[PDB]
Design a protein around this ligand. Structure first.
Ligand SMILES: COc1ccc(CC(=O)O)cc1-c1cccs1
Ligand SMILES: [Zn+2]
Length: 558
């Protein structure tokens, strides 16, 4: 307990003698409690151009620790042996061609400069001086400020912990360990436009249905056993690298100190997965791959209830299954953190729930022992929040595109993050959403129309600033003043590995829409008179926005 986290706790309490009290009214049943201390907008452009969505409930809803505080039952001994053998095989497989390595101050500095306000932090040598400090400490087996939360110098300590984590484990993302080519099941770096093609390729594999089971609170279900298995990547590092990485796992993952928000609370726990940590996506992806392989093994009859309870379980059958079929089984899945799609060899997988429940990965909103429902159409499978619709262009070429309920897209676009933002900043974020819709959601009639209206409304030279999403699947091709059709051709034709015919598309007229029935099923307002009124009266609203923005140069895209 205290040896590992004590120093971290002492600095906060000593620094906060101004108000350090122990509350006996603290609601912490699972996390350890140490003490606490006292502490202290709609996007108008988009809203004006989407009047019909002013009513829609999902749009209004978006404008406006209960699960974290639980314990996960320890997995059984046989399960623990199976997870261990599987983790060792997977880590060796992921490391077959790549070697782990330390990440550097330069790499981290360059990432920050192109992604706030830590830019000022990385430009000051004082920041790097303290980092050299937890590092000497993180190297002797201790950390003193390496803590996380759920114009004060405390910010430097937080950013410092993140850099130290990046230095030790950033190579998983920086060297693409979870790319599809390296990991087989991974989709890191593919991007949203490619996920649909990946599911369609998965559907070609012979087998049973496609399963996409959601886990309830995945981060809260990461056990002490999962963390031990995740740490096995350490055996592949160089001694200098092994020392720092071991420090990150032992002192910040296997032990943690957190701050929650009026007053602030200091709590600690030896399990669960940290919120903002750098290795979270990669470690979650690795653990999900291991669990899904284990579920496939149970599905094939390789693992039984007796095997899960057996403390003296023999490795040979697991090693043989992994060695002869493990890569093929990995190839049947698309896994991004807690999102997974699995196409097992047959439908026995639907009822293979002993190991999955035993590892703590309990499926959300379904009785624990009810069989999973699979899909026979890859187009109905949900993954990373999306539908993947397959489309035929007028020229006969086929595209695979992503659908999501239209109210979710319009609702997000209508929200600006942060107050005190000028119209120019607001118009630019609107342009970013509009251009994102042109690139990814061009097949929705309402979004293409709203997209044309926003771009007509804002000055053509203006550069979209601010991100429309934090998703790891977003490549931000829409953050540009380059012609969107040129970008569309580059993304969907030129750089598209699934498009053999490279003939460019010269007009938006040749860029297809979803079928009218499907567009309506996915939330389109097309066919309602209110939509027709909006479409007819859109130029008037565009002129209204242009007049408020001022005398700048605009283009008509209707
Ligand atoms: C898997 O891709 C996503 C998942 C979720 C979301 C919603 C959000 O994060 O704001 C957006 C996306 C993307 C939109 C455009 C390129 S990625
Ligand atoms: Zn530390």
């Amino acid at each position: 307990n205290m040896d590992v986290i004590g120093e971290r706790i002492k600095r906060i309490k000593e620094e906060h003698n101004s108000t350090w009290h122990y509350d006996d009214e603290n609601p912490y049943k699972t996390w350890a409690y140490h003490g606490s201390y006292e502490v202290k907008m709609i996007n108008g452009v988009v809203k004006l151009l989407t009047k019909p969505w002013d009513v829609v409930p999902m749009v209004t809803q978006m404008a406006m620790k209960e699960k974290v505080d639980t314990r996960t039952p320890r997995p059984l001994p046989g399960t623990r042996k199976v997870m261990e053998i599987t983790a060792e095989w997977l880590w060796r497989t992921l490391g077959r061609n790549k070697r782990p390595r330390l990440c550097t101050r330069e790499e981290f500095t360059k990432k920050v400069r192109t992604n706030d306000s830590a830019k000022a932090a990385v430009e000051d040598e004082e920041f790097w001086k303290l980092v050299d400090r937890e590092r000497e400490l993180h190297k002797l087996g201790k950390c003193g400020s390496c803590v996380y939360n759920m114009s004060r110098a405390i910010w430097y300590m937080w950013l410092g912990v993140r850099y130290l984590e990046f230095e030790a484990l950033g190579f998983l993302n920086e060297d693409h360990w979870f790319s599809r080519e390296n990991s087989y099941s991974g989709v890191e770096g593919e991007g949203l436009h490619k996920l649909g093609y990946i599911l369609r390729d998965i559907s070609k594999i012979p087998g049973g249905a496609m399963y996409a089971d959601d886990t309830a609170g995945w981060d809260t279900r990461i056990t002490e056993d999962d963390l031990h298995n995740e740490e096995k990547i350490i055996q592949q590092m160089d001694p200098e690298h092994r020392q720092l990485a071991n420090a990150i796992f032992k002192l910040t993952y296997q032990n943690k100190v957190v701050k929650v928000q009026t007053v602030m609370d200091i709590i600690s726990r030896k399990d669960q997965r940290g919120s903002g940590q750098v290795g979270t996506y990669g470690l979650n992806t690795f653990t999900n791959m291991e669990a899904q392989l284990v579920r496939q093994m149970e599905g094939e009859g390789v693992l039984t209830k007796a095997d899960l309870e057996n403390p003296h379980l023999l490795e040979k059958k697991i090693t043989q299954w992994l060695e002869t079929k493990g890569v093929e089984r990995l190839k049947r899945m698309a896994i991004s953190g807690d999102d997974c799609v699995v196409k097992p060899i047959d439908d026995r997988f639907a009822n293979a729930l002993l190991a999955l429940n035993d590892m703590g990965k309990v499926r959300k909103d379904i009785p624990q022992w009810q069989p999973s429902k699979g899909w026979h159409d890859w187009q109905q499978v949900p993954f990373c929040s999306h539908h993947f619709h397959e489309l035929i262009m007028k020229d006969g070429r086929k595209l695979v595109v992503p659908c999501r309920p239209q109210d979710e897209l319009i609702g997000r676009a209508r929200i600006s993050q942060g107050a005190g933002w000028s119209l120019r900043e607001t118009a630019c974020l609107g342009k970013a959403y509009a251009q994102m819709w042109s690139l990814m959601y061009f097949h929705r009639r309402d979004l293409r129309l709203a997209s044309n209206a926003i771009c007509s409304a804002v000055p053509v030279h203006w550069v979209p600033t601010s991100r429309t999403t934090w998703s790891i699947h977003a490549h931000h091709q829409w953050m540009t003043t380059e012609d969107m059709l040129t970008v569309w051709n580059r993304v969907w034709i030129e750089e598209n590995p699934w498009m053999e015919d490279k003939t460019p598309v010269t007009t938006w007229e040749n860029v297809p829409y979803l079928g009218k029935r499907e567009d309506q099923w996915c939330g389109s307002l097309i066919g309602l008179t209110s939509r027709a009124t909006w479409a007819q009266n859109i130029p008037t609203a565009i002129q209204q926005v242009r007049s408020l923005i001022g005398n700048e140069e605009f283009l008509d895209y209707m």
